[PDB]
Design a protein around this ligand. Sequence first.
Ligand SMILES: Cc1cc2c(cc1C)N(C[C@H](O)[C@H](O)[C@H](O)COP(=O)(O)OP(=O)(O)OC[C@H]1O[C@@H](n3cnc4c(N)ncnc43)[C@H](O)[C@@H]1O)c1[nH]c(=O)[nH]c(=O)c1N2
Ligand SMILES: Cc1cc2c(cc1C)N(C[C@H](O)[C@H](O)[C@H](O)COP(=O)(O)OP(=O)(O)OC[C@H]1O[C@@H](n3cnc4c(N)ncnc43)[C@H](O)[C@@H]1O)c1[nH]c(=O)[nH]c(=O)c1N2
Ligand SMILES: [Cl-]
Ligand SMILES: [Cl-]
Ligand SMILES: [Cl-]
Ligand SMILES: [Cl-]
Lengths: 361, 361, 380, 380
Amino acid sequence: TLGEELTELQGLARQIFTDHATHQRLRAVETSESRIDETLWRELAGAGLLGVALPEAAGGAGLGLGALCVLLEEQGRHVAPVPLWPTLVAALAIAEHGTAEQRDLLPGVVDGSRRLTVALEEFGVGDVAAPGCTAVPDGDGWRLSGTKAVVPSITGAAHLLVSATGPDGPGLFLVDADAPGLSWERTETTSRDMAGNLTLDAVPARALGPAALPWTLDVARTALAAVQLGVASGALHITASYLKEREQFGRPLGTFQAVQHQLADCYIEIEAMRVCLWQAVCAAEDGATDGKAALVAKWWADEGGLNVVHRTQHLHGGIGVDVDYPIHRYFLWGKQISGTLGGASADLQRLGDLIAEGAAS
Amino acid sequence: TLGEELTELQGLARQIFTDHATHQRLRAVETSESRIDETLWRELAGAGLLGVALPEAAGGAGLGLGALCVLLEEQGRHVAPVPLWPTLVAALAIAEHGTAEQRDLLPGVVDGSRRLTVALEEFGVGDVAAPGCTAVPDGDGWRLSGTKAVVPSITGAAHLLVSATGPDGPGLFLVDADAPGLSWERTETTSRDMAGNLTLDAVPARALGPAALPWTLDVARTALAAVQLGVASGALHITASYLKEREQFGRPLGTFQAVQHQLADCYIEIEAMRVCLWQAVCAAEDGATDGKAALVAKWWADEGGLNVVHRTQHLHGGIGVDVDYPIHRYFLWGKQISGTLGGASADLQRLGDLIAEGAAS
Amino acid sequence: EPAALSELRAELRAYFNGLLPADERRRVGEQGVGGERFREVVKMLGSDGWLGYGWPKEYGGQGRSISEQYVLFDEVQRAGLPFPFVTVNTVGPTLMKYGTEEQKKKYLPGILSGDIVFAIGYTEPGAGTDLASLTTRAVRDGDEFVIDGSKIFTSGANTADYIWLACRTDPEAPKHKGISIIIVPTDAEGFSWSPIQTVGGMVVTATYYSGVRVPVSEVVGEINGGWKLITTQLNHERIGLAALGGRMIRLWEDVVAWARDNGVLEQPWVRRDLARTYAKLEAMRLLNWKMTIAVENDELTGADAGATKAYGTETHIDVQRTLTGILGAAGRIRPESPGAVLAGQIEQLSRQGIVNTFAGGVNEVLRDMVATLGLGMPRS
Amino acid sequence: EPAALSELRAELRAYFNGLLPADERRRVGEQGVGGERFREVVKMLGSDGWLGYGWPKEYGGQGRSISEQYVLFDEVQRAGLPFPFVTVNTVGPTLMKYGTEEQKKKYLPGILSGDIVFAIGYTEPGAGTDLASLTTRAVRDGDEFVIDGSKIFTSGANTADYIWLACRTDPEAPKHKGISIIIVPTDAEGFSWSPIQTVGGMVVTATYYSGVRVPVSEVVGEINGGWKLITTQLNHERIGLAALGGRMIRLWEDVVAWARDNGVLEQPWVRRDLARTYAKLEAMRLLNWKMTIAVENDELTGADAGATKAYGTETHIDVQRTLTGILGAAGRIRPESPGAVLAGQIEQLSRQGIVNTFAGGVNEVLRDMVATLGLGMPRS
Ligand SMILES: Cc1cc2c(cc1C)N(C[C@H](O)[C@H](O)[C@H](O)COP(=O)(O)OP(=O)(O)OC[C@H]1O[C@@H](n3cnc4c(N)ncnc43)[C@H](O)[C@@H]1O)c1[nH]c(=O)[nH]c(=O)c1N2
Ligand SMILES: Cc1cc2c(cc1C)N(C[C@H](O)[C@H](O)[C@H](O)COP(=O)(O)OP(=O)(O)OC[C@H]1O[C@@H](n3cnc4c(N)ncnc43)[C@H](O)[C@@H]1O)c1[nH]c(=O)[nH]c(=O)c1N2
Ligand SMILES: [Cl-]
Ligand SMILES: [Cl-]
Ligand SMILES: [Cl-]
Ligand SMILES: [Cl-]
């Protein structure tokens, strides 16, 4: 059945991530130029995990956003350094909103030779739904001028989906990473990713379909919430194990009521995160387009997920800030994810406008 | 010294409130028509406590907003049913912004024969700074038309200060309780006060000075925060005593770490409430007019004060909802106060506009 | 399929409308099991077939699905009417499991028909959270038990026909192993009750048992095996808190509509608070749904039940606080006073929501259990 | 009067400007006591007279007021420079109280002149929150102590001249009564350290003591009476957290200005978050002020110290989280990478604020003490 395939998916990803997201390998990758584990990427491709969410006509399994979320959740459990959500959200945007020519890029994503990223953010106000980056018509193509902020995992990406406002409003456009007029500055982020601040000077581009931008934002929000769920789950698991071991005052820290209550609040928040994630997935597969379910999943990620990784830092005491101990990476990932596409307060504002607008319908 | 006078003030109020805010008397007063203890009112007048904050020329002690806050804090400690903040905030508004004719009402407030209330709220959006109630010029007077919401402790008040918008903007106007065109409907509130929904049909009125409205709102916010501080302090005290007595699992509830931590969070919030209250008082006496300090004190009242009385309900278990046990009144007072002139979210919005405006100065 | 639930919804409105009037609904809903007209409603619902709607047809019920069951609970609350949750959804299903064939025959039909109502007799002045320390005693005399003690906060005892009574039957056993459940008729000689008024408007009771005599066949389950019955009925005591959340969702919707029509919805702070409570209500209702499925399947873990109940009851209070703020000056007006909004329901529910973070399991203890049962944390 | 503090402020900017460059300030400020140029700064500050600014003139200081002292701490942080808080504000004042006349003469002048820096040696792998369980031992040999053990997270041990070392001197006494403070030179034979890098960018150390020998005159206070010294210096270890809050207030102001100038301030959610953090920062700074007055007066209660420290350190984290959100996409950019706002300070401080809810007293234990010492709650 579908659940059995998703269980198989989960076990496979877990084994691959477990074999490569190790003390030694995380340190090697997080001090490299790309901050990307190319070995892990090739292993994922070879196990079919890059293809599992993508269409059959491109060699994938055709299992869609649910399979993507299962893979991303395992990835977050291990803070595994590969750009799965930028590449696979971009690929799902192409699959669902691209031209035939654009969908011909998907086979290379399935087999691991072609990575992508998405440039959905801007400095300042940075309304992701109203990019300041401009798109100008040029024959049957477009030229883009503007700047985008902190494009994730830019190294080795062959193409980028870039949000921009054209004459008919915001849209999503495919750009080759070697396009003329395109340049970036590498910038290191909280999570230790190597992002790019992107400058576009009349860069040639090709549009995706008219619904690509709001669709891609909902999927990206859902995907980020999947990673955050895995980050928080892994953080809680490590912290629970540690608090059984560490004794003070003659007993395990895990026996103190305040410790148990902080752990329980993490557990509660994780359960809440998880059911709202799957509601967002189910809503997307059932053709919802109002955006509320994705924002609810994302707010839980932004607020609950960030609470969890702050509590798991605190519960560790000094060893939790040692960079040779694992938990600090969950803090760094959780913190970065909770602001990606905007933080908790922004997401409440956007969700509140959707609620108000729907009530006035 | 001034502090010694404020200490004397506090002990006197404490004794009077302790003698009359008893199990029997609170029940008698909260089931009466007025919900006002006239005996307590006369005792307060006779001890000079109604006059302590008012000017010497009216027979008061001239000790201003600080003395008022000391008295209100003791009042909240005992949930004592008398309309001190409506009468004395109105009287301070008259003292500082009234005409000579209006200040001639103050002797009757000092000696206890004359009470007042304030009508600062409206149903709906209810922006207290932009009343929908209208003020029309009529010779050297005014006529007011509109409605005001839930005017506190309306019974026995001889005059009301009513906020309204005239041709030159929002203002504050004195109205006699027997004025033609004035009527109200009694309405019982959460705290068990008997408020009045006020209808004004071209009611004769006299203006206070131009700065009366924003001044009175800052003072009222500060005064409400003083009562809330006393409510939260008294609630915490009762709850601490109870948790020493009640045993489960063979030991006092007070020994459970989660119980100690809930009590500590109340303590912390009360300390925060208290220093911000006194900053608001000091700012008003130092002539600040920006309103930020009063809103900070009020937000702490609205959010911290409400948190305290929810925690002290929870920590009592079933007996805390018994109306024959004291703590539920602190819940009712805390809850009502935390919404008076607006709740925590409104106060953050107003404070955020002041911050933004001051930064753009 | 979802057309069927819609149709069920519309049928139940017509039906409750033919029973309720206006304020009466919000009057019998505030009193709960302790109210005067409670039995009048129950008997009406029972003879019309709605009490056994979710019961197995083996025991005379319709065997309807969880989806349909929730529509029923949501619509009874919406109508203002009280529903005998404890008796129909808590006692009956524990009897169906642990009752003798004889016990089932005496009680289940009258429960079904709306003729028998039960009240829960657990809590004592000395044994609240530490329920396993209860001391109300039942001593063997022959084939009778003699019951001496008292209970406190016995909701509905003034309107019930029987008490589901937790008693100490073996004073020398481990505390968890010394307890039995005994059914005590409320007309028994030596039984008495006195009212307790709550800040929320409900009247519950203290109940007293002085030499009360009950045949030994009125013990449910095995003697000294009462703890597993207590837990079984306490777990079923979450399907009610799920329906309670359903009611707060409806009130949230009503507040959205109210704020839309008077401009309060144009305030940024209001929109943000409605967004935050929407998101927390979404998690609650989804967790409630999963946990109802588990409980009616006999697969709910202690960790998940505790996490869901503590999260849901704290969310009801968060939503109550937040919607009260949105209501502005009217947020403080009690039911039946002029200017109340939505008949004062959110004002009155704020004074009641404070109960459910310690009733049906104390949220501190539920968090302990989440840590120990859910994460394997050591005790002591 | 407030003109004097203004003038002090303006003088200290000119002064620090003549020392700092650009990024160097945020580079030595991130490393803290463990950084390479730390001693270089300390010695400069010391010879220029700023280290004893708040010390009593009896011990060679200027005796300046708390207001002036806070201006100094706020301006050093603003400049990026590290200040020897622990040595000047924590060790010196405990020595002035419990030191021999001899001890004061050996240490205080070099502290004053910026020539002596101390590191705190409390925490062990087996004794963190339960510091009174420490096992590093110091045994009498004659008029020498022989010290064997290790400590962990000894900040500045790589740059300090002496360790303020908590040792077990009486293995048979109550744990609180078996401890002494001993000053160990960092050039002593048998002393060694190794680096520990933190997620926040700081390097602290583990320190090791293998047969280290120190004269018995290097015990501060009475032998086995070390616990009162530990607490004294831990209480003085709050004047630093007050200055830390001062730094978050400045950063809050800078974020207001930044959001004003790029339109982020026009977002309702931003305004609301700035309002909430303003209100929480106001309470923090006022509580810090009261508590500094108390501590320099020898009148701070355990309840108030614990409440103020736990509130302030949790508020620093709340403000860090909230300002990061307001910064948008730039909120995630590390110092020294392109696009960082305010040199990435709030990003880096977010990775450090997590320390101070468990350093200088563990906030859970501080809440225990608030309940027991502040409200009289029973223990155990
Ligand atoms: C309106 C209403 C209706 C009902 C009931 C109550 C009310 C108010 N109940 C009673 C309910 O079950 C009872 O109140 C709880 O079991 C709590 O017991 P106590 O009230 O004695 O609080 P108790 O004194 O045990 O605990 C009080 C507070 O202490 C704290 N606490 C307790 N143990 C702790 C721990 N281990 N660790 C940390 N904190 C701890 C919690 O904050 C708790 O809320 C009831 N009962 C019944 O038998 N039949 C019924 O029908 C009802 N219905
Ligand atoms: C950057 C930096 C710098 C320094 C230091 C640390 C760090 C990270 N410290 C060490 C600091 O004092 C130490 O980390 C704390 O005392 C906590 O001890 P543990 O780290 O062993 O946590 P430990 O394992 O004791 O406790 C870990 C967590 O368990 C919980 N906990 C503990 N006891 C509890 C209880 N009773 N009830 C409930 N929950 C409880 C808390 O959540 C706590 O945070 C230090 N030390 C030193 O000697 N000199 C120095 O200079 C410094 N400086
Ligand atoms: Cl770089
Ligand atoms: Cl009335
Ligand atoms: Cl019932
Ligand atoms: Cl130092």
